Design a protein around this ligand. Sequence first.
Ligand SMILES: O=c1[nH]c2cc(C(F)(F)F)c(N3CCOCC3)cc2n(CP(=O)(O)O)c1=O
Ligand SMILES: O=c1[nH]c2cc(C(F)(F)F)c(N3CCOCC3)cc2n(CP(=O)(O)O)c1=O
Ligand SMILES: CCCCCCCC/C=C/CCCCCCCC(=O)OC[C@H](O)CO
Ligand SMILES: CCCCCCCC/C=C\CCCCCCCC(=O)OC[C@H](O)CO
Ligand SMILES: CCCCCCCCCCCCCCCC(=O)O
Lengths: 48, 115, 144, 222, 175, 48
Amino acid sequence: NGMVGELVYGRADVAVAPLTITLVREEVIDFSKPFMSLGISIMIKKPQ
Amino acid sequence: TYIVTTILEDPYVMLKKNANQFEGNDRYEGYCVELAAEIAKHVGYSYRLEIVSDGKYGARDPDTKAWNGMVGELVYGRADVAVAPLTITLVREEVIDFSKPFMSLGISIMIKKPQ
Amino acid sequence: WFFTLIIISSYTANLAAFLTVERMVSPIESAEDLAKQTEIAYGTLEAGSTKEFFRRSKIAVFEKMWTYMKSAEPSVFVRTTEEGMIRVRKSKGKYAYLLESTMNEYIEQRKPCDTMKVGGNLDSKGYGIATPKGSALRGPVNLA
Amino acid sequence: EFGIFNSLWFSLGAFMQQGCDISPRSLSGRIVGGVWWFFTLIIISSYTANLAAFLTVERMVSPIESAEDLAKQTEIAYGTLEAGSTKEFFRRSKIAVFEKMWTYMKSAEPSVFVRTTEEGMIRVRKSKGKYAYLLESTMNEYIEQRKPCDTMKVGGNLDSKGYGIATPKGSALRGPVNLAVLKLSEQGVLDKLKSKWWYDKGECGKDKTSALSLSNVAGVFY
Amino acid sequence: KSKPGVFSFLDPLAYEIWMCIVFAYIGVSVVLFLVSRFSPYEWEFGIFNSLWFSLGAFMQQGCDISPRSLSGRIVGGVWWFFTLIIISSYTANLAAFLTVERMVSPIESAEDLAKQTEIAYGTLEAGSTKEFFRRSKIAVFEKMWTYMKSAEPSVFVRTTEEGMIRVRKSKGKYA
Amino acid sequence: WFFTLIIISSYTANLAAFLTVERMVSPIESAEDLAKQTEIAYGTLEAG
Ligand SMILES: O=c1[nH]c2cc(C(F)(F)F)c(N3CCOCC3)cc2n(CP(=O)(O)O)c1=O
Ligand SMILES: O=c1[nH]c2cc(C(F)(F)F)c(N3CCOCC3)cc2n(CP(=O)(O)O)c1=O
Ligand SMILES: CCCCCCCC/C=C/CCCCCCCC(=O)OC[C@H](O)CO
Ligand SMILES: CCCCCCCC/C=C\CCCCCCCC(=O)OC[C@H](O)CO
Ligand SMILES: CCCCCCCCCCCCCCCC(=O)O
């Protein structure tokens, strides 16, 4: 489904979204080198 | 059997203290050596951990327009894969293929511990 | 005189106690910190990659966090990112949300400004530009 | 006899919890005296209490916590390696903060630059916290966990870059190697390896409060 | 075992502070005497009374007599200030001493030994204990093994007697 | 005067210490303690 679907089934020829590079998606499409590095992080209520 | 080029940089690839006592791939220890082990296990192939003679990460000298170091050793067919802390860059990307980064990093500030 | 001596010493001693513990208070500056303590609760989206990261994790800290999150009633997990954000806002510092760093930083700059990101990342991911397999755009886009 | 000089002496003695030769006798003098007595009691107790707090728990604070701090301040020096790409990042930056930092670093006497990372590390060590060295984050974290364990990394990263596995341009290993790296990343192998070789092998993984020395009361003697 | 020490009540301040307090006491008493007397306009602050005023000021017991001149009041005022700072410093540092003596948690687990670095520890070079460490799959013992590998001077002992004596001699730096 | 100053400071200092850090101590630390004491009761399963 989604943007990966739209690329696999020829409906689109590029995706420029925050699309996470992963093994499963790497198998079916080609990714570029990451344009934005990130990770999981902790958000807390700001101490006032 | 593939030749896997490498550089000497702690803690990536380090000569074990019992270097003379060991021979082969078990001459070396570190982060990158176990990475190469795992990569081989997943792909299949077998390898020997060669070390870049010059001991430098590659660069293209403008005067001669030649590649040195690991990138040179990889572009001129001497090596089959480089498992080292090579930085992904545009100039190097044009000449070789890189994998997705196995380690993200950046520039940072080092100071003396406050006392 | 005796009453005075006891009462004044009590005032001084208790004020020292107040100021000393106010000076021992360490915030959450890391994930293991959130893990080992129990006073603050924390959760993630019910459906998404973060939950999967936790479910499949072989690392001690994240295994512990998963065991906690699963064995938690009322459920720490939230329906949508907005729900988690509001739960953090209205929890009064007893709920921490766990989410992608980029969304965290974005939400940090949106009023109400009563959220912050603590510590480094637990994981490393990237976002990329994607092209169909065997496209001619691939190499140019990568270099770009 | 509360003339102005005696008034000043009464008040001083009240604040120092010393005596008085004379006390007020009127209602108005006693109100004044009473509130000054209450004020004194609170203020002195606050001084003692807070000094106890300070001496009980040690909070050591790093002056720097970001790159903009190195930018705005001037007392602390900072420089890179000439040989490496780090210098070049600054030389061509075109971000305000880093452009300013480059302008500083170029016009710095003596030379902020060093030849090798060892030289920079020693320079940071030797100085009492007046030189900050800019370098790759991974090397920074490694050095932080190695002996003598007297440095630290401060703030976030200034830029973002990656290390990859390289293969020759036409190679058939490419796709397999790429998928291998992604698989390792997602299985947590790479994190584990980094943890092992940075932290688990780390050399350097709130008591015995001392007598006050002459040095931290020398001012009162002077 | 903790045997306090007969004059341990002096511990909050260094020996040099106590000795300088005594010198300051004498100097203040002598200057108070001098500025109170040689003024021939008046000549109750002889030397003995000066010493008594100063002593009582330091102990915050007040006085039968206070200085009336400007010079005597300057002397008195600075000695009052000094007294206030020094006494508060004594009480504050004593609180600090007794508070941390009360925060100290003993070692009573393995991970406790593992995480810290102040205490060193070893085992026989040949034994099942060493094997248990070498093959250990959990964090704590793996970390302890890694530490024991990088031991200088060598933690491992030839005989149990050697280890026992090392513990005895170490003064709580070897387990 | 000197005695008074030390004693009163010791009282204030030690109360600060007490109020700063809580230490709860268990009365029992062994079976012989249950034996010697009589204030605390103790019993097992009626049959086991
Ligand atoms: O490729 C992906 N890119 C994503 C990018 C973003 C954002 F940063 F906001 F752009 C987020 N947001 C944070 C979480 O709440 C929803 C919105 C989700 C993403 N998800 C969903 P996952 O399945 O949870 O990873 C992807 O899959
Ligand atoms: O590909 C590259 N990989 C690199 C990897 C590392 C390290 F992290 F240690 F593994 C280092 N360290 C920088 C810190 O001091 C020690 C050497 C430099 C590298 N350089 C040189 P630069 O990028 O020109 O500075 C490269 O080129
Ligand atoms: C015979 C002559 C005697 C006359 C002179 C005596 C003066 C001594 C006492 C002063 C403190 C008085 C004021 C105490 C402050 C009250 C503040 C208060 O009640 O605060 C409420 C609180 O803030 C709700 O939240
Ligand atoms: C009628 C009354 C007669 C008056 C009697 C006079 C004596 C005053 C007494 C004590 C205060 C002296 C202590 C305060 C000394 C000031 C110096 C100081 O605090 O210096 C800090 C420095 O500026 C670092 O920034
Ligand atoms: C104004 C006079 C006040 C009285 C002060 C008491 C002086 C104590 C004794 C001073 C000598 C040194 C004592 C410290 C010795 C030590 O513990 O090492």
